[PDB]
Symmetry: D3
Subunit: 245 residues, 6 copies
C-alpha cells in the first residue's frame, strides 16, 4: 500500500540541480522550510558505498547553504523491492566522518527518521543527528561495530553516552544487540516513537514547530548544546554566531 | 482551597529582616534547617521583573550565609487571583538572573526546586540549575519558550539540561518548545519525583529533612564533587576551597602555622606522606 | 535458589590462600568470577579484603585469555539468610585509599567488568557497582543505597560524579543527598542498571552477556572501552586509548620496515 | 619616586569609610584604581580587608563607564621603606572563604583587570595576581613568592591550576613546590607577567595599557574575555559567554518583532 | 631582487587543474611531498574576499586528499607591486571558519610561513596552523579583532592561549598591538625566526624532516595533539585513525 | 672523573630489599626524605627492555608507599663504558611503560627528572610526565624519536608536552624529531632549570630539600590540584580522595562514626554549614 509508506509524495518537490543523484533522494517541502534527504538503495538495505557518501555530503552541504531551510529530515527510502524489508541505513557496503561533522556543524536542526534498520555506520548517523523519531513497527537499532574489527570511536560511540548514559552506551556497543524504537526511546536515544505510516508526517510536524521559532535562536541553541562536547570547535561555531550578532 | 494549597502556613515563620519584600516571600522552617524562597507575583504567573531578581538574589544570598540552613526550597506562590491558575515562574516579565543561577549553583547547600505550576523561559532554567526538582502531578508545566520569543539561555538553562536528560531530549525541549507534564519530565530525568499538588511542599520538606539528617560537610563536598567537572576551574576552586578548609583544621596545619609565629622551623616529622 | 552454579566454575590456580574473596575461571568461556566472600558481615570489606580484591583483579587484568570479569558477592548470610553484593567498608599507613586503587583497576583494565548486584550495594559497595562497565541486578534482592554522608564520609570521584554520567545530574544528586534505598528495577529506570534478572538467574544471565561480549573482536572491545572512558578520564583516558593505537601500529608495515 | 600620581585620580564617591583599601576613578579614562592600603603590614589582608576589596570591586563591576580595573598595592611601608602589592592573608562563620569570592569577582566581571605588582606578591597576594587578566610588574621591587605550603596551606584553584595555563605545568609546579622568590623579569620570561616596567612608571604604563584597552569596542572586549575564560571555566564560562550572546540578541530584529 | 624573494621558483611546479585560480597560487614541490598554498593579492596586502576563501578552501581540500603530500606550506606572495610592502594575509577585505577547520582536521602538517603582515583573519589562520615560521625582517603580527566590533572567539583567540598562555593571549587580543617574529617566538606562537629570503627554504627544510618520518605516525600525532582541545571531534578523528590501523 | 660524575656516592645508601636489581639502581638519601631511581644500563644508552620496566615499576611503587619519602629523583647512571657517552634514557630497547607513567603521575610525591644525557623516545616521554625537570647543560639531549621509528606516544608523552611548552613547540618537537639542548628546552618551558653536569644531582637534592621542608600534605594536595583538570575524573578521584581523608579526621566525622556504633542519632548541631 502506497498509503502505508512513510513518504507523502504530495508534500515534496525535487530540489533543482540534483537529477543526477542515484543513491540519494533530495526533496524540498512544498510549504515549510524543510528538506528530505534519504538513502535510496532499498535493494541493499540502504547500505552506503563511496558514491553514496559523495552524494550524501553534496546534498547535505547544499541544504546547509540554503538560507530558506531550517530543518533537515534524514531518512531512508523503502521498502526493499527485493524482500519488502525496511531500512534507514545498514552502514558501509570522501569519508562518512565528514558527513557526520557536516550534520553536527550545520546551523540547522537535523532530525533522523529511523524507518527501519539503523546498523553500523547507519546507527552512528542517527546518533549524531540532533533529534530522532523512529518507526514503532520497523525501526531496528543495532551497533554492528565490535563484531567486525571496526568500530566508531567518536560521535558514533562516545556521543551515544551523552544521550543514554555510560552504562547503556557501553551495552549497545559491547553486545551489539538489536533494539526497537520503544527500547531506544526508554534509554534516551530516540525522542519519540511513531506509527510507521506517520513517521514522516510526525517528522514534518516537529520540523514545523521548530521552524515557527526564531531561526537565530535555534542556531545559537544548537551550538550551545554542541559547545559542550566539541571543545574549541564548538566554541568557534558558537562564538562565530555571537560575532554575527 | 486552603488545605489544598501546597503552602503549609503552620510550618513556616517569616525570616527576620525581610518585611520589605514585595515580589518574593522568604520563610524559615519552624524546626528543620530549611528555608522557603518563593516567587510572589501569582497575578502575573510569577514572572520576574528586575526588582524581583534583586530580591531573589538578596534572599538566596542570605540563605547561603545562614550557618543553620542546609536546604533551600525554591517555589512559586499561588494560585493566581485573576484566574486561579498555578505557576512556579513564567520567566522574564515582558514589560541579573544569571547571577542568581550561579548563586544557586555555588551555594554550599542543596537547593530543591518545587515546580507547583508553569515553569517557562527563565523560570524553566531556574528549575534546571537547582540540585533537585519535585513537581506537582496535576499542575506542573514545563515549557522552554526562549526560542519563540527570540531569546535563549545558552548556558545552565540549556547545556546543563543535557546533563540531566541527555542530548536528544534536551535539544527536543529547546527546539520545539513543547509543554511537558511532571511525569514526562520525570521520565526524561529532569524531575526527581512527582507529588500530588497539595503535598508538593510536604514531600519537599520530607526530602529536606532526610538531607539535613546527614553530615553537613559531606553534603557540601558532594555537591561540589558533582559540580566539579562541568564547572571547570570554577568547580575546582569551590571543591578545593572546601579541601583547604579541612586541611587548615589538621594537626599538621596547626604545626607550620604555630612554627611560623614562634619564628622557628616547622616539624613535619609527626606526619606521614599518605598514599 | 542460589545464583552460583558450582558446575560452571573452576578455582583459579594460585589463589588457594584467599579468605575474603573467591576467584573462579569459567570452565569454557574467557570469563572469571570475582566475589566478596564475607556474607556473615554483609560482604563488607576490611583492608585485607581490598588487598585480596586488588590482587585478584590485577591477575584477571593480566590474563590474556580472559575478556570478561563478573564482580559479585557470595551469599546468603549464614546468620540471617539476607543477600548482599557488598555493603561497603567494615566500620601509620593504615590510612591507605586502597579501594580507590581497586576502582582505577576496574576502570583501566582492557576487559569488560560486569557487576552482578545480588543484594545490598551500599557505600563503597555501591561505588564499586557504579565504576563497573555494566551492571545486572537481582530483581528480588538487589538493594542500592548510598550511605556515605550518614557517617560523614563521601566518595567524590567515580562513586558520585561518574554516577551522574549514567543517570544524569538530578538523579545522581538525589541518590547521594537523601541516601534512599532503591530496587533493581528503579535503578534500571534511572539508567545505572543495564538489566534486571531473577535472583537465581543472575549469574546465568551474566554469563550470557559475557559470552556475547567474548564472541566479538577482543581488540575492538578494548578500543571501545577506552573510547568511552576517554570522555571523562582526560589525559589518563587519552593515554590508555592512545596506548592501544600504539599497540596496533607496532604490528604494522611502516612500523616494520622503519624500525 | 612613587608609582602613584595623585593628580590623575579622584576618590570614588561613597567610599570615604574605607580603611584597608583605596578606590580611585581616573580623571579622564574609564579606569579605576583599587589598592591594598596596609603598607605597614606588607599589605596583608584580614577579613575586613577582603570585605572592602569585594565591595570595591563589585562596585567597579557595576560601573557602566568603567572598562578597566587596575589592582595594586600602596606603599612604601612607613616602617622600613619596603614595597608590596599584597603579602597574602594576615596571620562561627569566621571560616568564610571570602578571598575566593574576590577571585571569582575578578574572573567574572566583564572588564579587564590588570594587576600592577609594585612589590611583594605572596601567598593569597600571589594568587590574586594570577587570576587577573593581565599583569605588569615593577622591575626593581616586584617579588613573586608562593608561600602557601610553608604554613601547610594551599590554593588548589585559580592560584595554582590557573598558573599552569600561563607558564605551563613544569614552571607552575616549580613555583608552588619550592616556593622560591622570583623577579618581574623572571616571571615575565615564564609567561605570568605581561611586561616589566620601571617602578616609578608602573602605574603610568598601566594607564597606557588601560587606555589602549578602552579605545576599542567595549562589547568586543567583554566577549573576548569570556571567550578566553570559557576554556577553563566549563559551564560557568559557557554561561557568562552565552549570557553575552543573549545580550546582543535582545537588541535584534528577530528579537524585536517576535517578542 | 628576485633572489631576495622568499619564493624559490625552481623548486615548484603548478598543480594540474588549477589554472583558473586568481586569488591563490598552488604549487607542488619538484621532489618532496610538500605543496605551497599562498595568498595571491599583494596589491591589497593579501586580504581575502569571499572568492579568495572559495579558492583557498578548494586548494587546501585538494591537498588534503593528495595521498602523496605530507606537508602544506601556507604563506602569502609578495611584495606588493603598489608599495613594496610584505604581507601573509591582512584578513577580510563559504566561510573562513571552514578553512580553519580544514587546516585543523587534515591529516597533514600545515606550516604557516609568515612573510609579512598577519592581521585579523590572517593572524587567526597562522594560529590554527600546526607550526609557524616567520620572517625576521618583515613578519608583523597584529590581532585586529577588538578594534572593529568583530573578533575571532575560537581558534583565533582561545587556541592562541594554548600556545602562549592566557596572559599573553589576552594581551595580544585586548590591546591589538603589533609584534615582530622574534617577540612572537619568545611568547611561543612562532616556532622559529628566519631571514626573509630564507623563509621558504627553511620551511622546505622543516617539511623535509617531517616527511622523512612515518606518515602514519605523524598523522596519529597530530590528532593526539588536537584531541586535547577538540573534544568529541578530536576523539572522532583520532579514533578514526585508530580504526584504520 | 669520579668527582665529575653527577652521582655523589656519600649522599646515598642502597634501599634494603632491592639487591636483585640489575637494570635499575635505587638509593635512599642519608638524611633527607628523598630517593634516587636510575636507569642502570649505560652500555646501551640506558634503553629499557621489559625487565627494566618491571624493576622500574617495582622501585617506584615502593617509593610511592614509603611514608618517609617526599621526593623522587629519576635519572640515568653513566657514563657509558663503551664510549663514555651520557644518557638519562634512550627509550625502548629495539631487541608496560604506560603503567610506569601513571605511577609517576599519580604518586603523592614530587618526581623530579634529572636529565643527565640523552632523553629519547620513551625516555623523553618519561621526562615529560615527571613533575619537574632539571637538565645537564653540557650533555642533556632531548629528542622525540618516536615518529621515525614508526611509533608514537599519543598521551602523556605528547599531549602533556603541549601543557608545558604550548601547542606550537610541542608539535615541532614531535613532528621534526630534532635534538635539543637543556637550555633550548628550558626556554620552551619543559626544563625547569639548567645545571652544570657535575652538579645536576646536587642541585636536584637542593630542590628536593626545599620541597621536603614544606607541609607534606599541602604538597600532595597541590600536585593533585595541578593534575586535576588534565586528568578528568581520574584527577578528581585522586584529589577528592585526599579530601575525604581530611574530612575523616574531623570532629564532625568522628561524630556520625561514633553515633553509628552507639546505634544512636548523629548530632550535627555543633557543626556550621560553612560558606
Ligand atoms: C507560560 C504561559 C503559557 C502561561 O499559561 P496560560 O494560562 O495559558 O497563560 P496566559 O498567557 O493566557 O495568562 C496569564 C497572565 O500572566 C502574565 N504573564 C505570564 N508570563 C509572563 C511573562 N513571561 N512576561 C509578562 N507577563 C506574563 C500574562 O501577561 C497574563 O497577564 P494578564 O492576564 O493580567 O493580561 C504564558 O504566560 C507564556 O509566556
Ligand atoms: C639517542 C641516540 C642518538 C644516542 O646518541 P649516539 O651517541 O649518537 O648513539 P649511537 O646510536 O651511535 O650509540 C650507542 C649504543 O646505544 C644503544 N642504544 C641506544 N638507544 C637504543 C634503543 N632505543 N634501542 C636499542 N639499543 C639502543 C645502541 O644500540 C648502541 O649499542 P652498541 O654501541 O653496543 O652497538 C640513539 O641511540 C637513538 O636511538
Ligand atoms: O551525563 S551526561 O550528560 O553525559 C548524559 C546524561 C545521563 N542520562 C542518560 C539518560 N537519561 C535520559 C532519560 O532516559 C537521563 C540522564
Ligand atoms: O596551559 S596550556 O597547555 O594551555 C598552555 C601552556 C602554557 N605555556 C605558554 C607559553 N610557554 C611556551 C614557551 O614560551 C610555556 C607554557
Amino acid at each position: 500500500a502506497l498509503s502505508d509508506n512513510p513518504f507523502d509524495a504530495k508534500a515534496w518537490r525535487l530540489v533543482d540541480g540534483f537529477d543526477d543523484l542515484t543513491d540519494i533522494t533530495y526533496h524540498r517541502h512544498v510549504d515549510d522550510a524543510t528538506v528530505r534527504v534519504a538513502f535510496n538503495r532499498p535493494e541493499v538495505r540502504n547500505a552506503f558505498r563511496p558514491h553514496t557518501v559523495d552524494e550524501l555530503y553534496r546534498v547535505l552541504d547544499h541544504a546547509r547553504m540554503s538560507p530558506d531551510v531550517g530543518v533537515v529530515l534524514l531518512t531512508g527510502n523503502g521498502p526493499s523491492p527485493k524482500d519488502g524489508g525496511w531500512a534507514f541505513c545498514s552502514g558501509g557496503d570522501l569519508h562518512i566522518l565528514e558527513v557526520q561533522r557536516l550534520i553536527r556543524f550545520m546551523p540547522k536542526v537535523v532530525i533522523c527518521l529511523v524507518n527501519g534498520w539503523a546498523a553500523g555506520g547507519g546507527h552512528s548517523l542517527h546518533v549524531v543527528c540532533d533529534l530522532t523519531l523512529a518507526s514503532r513497527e520497523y525501526a531496528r537499532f543495532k551497533q554492528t561495530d565490535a563484531d567486525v574489527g571496526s568500530f566508531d570511536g567518536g560521535y558514533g560511540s562516545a556521543y551515544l553516552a551523552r544521550q543514554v548514559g555510560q552504562k547503556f552506551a557501553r551495552e549497545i556497543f559491547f553486545l551489539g544487540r538489536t533494539y526497537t524504537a520503544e527500547q531506544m526511546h526508554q534509554m534516551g536515544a530516540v525522542n519519540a516513537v511513531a506509527e510507521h505510516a506517520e513517521l514522516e508526517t510526525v517528522g514534518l510536524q516537529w520540523a514545523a514547530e521548530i521552524n515557527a521559532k526564531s531561526p537565530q535562536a535555534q542556531r545559537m541553541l544548537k551550538f550551545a548544546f554542541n559547545l559542550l562536547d566539541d571543545g574549541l570547535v564548538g566554541q568557534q561555531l558558537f562564538a562565530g554566531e555571537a560575532t554575527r550578532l
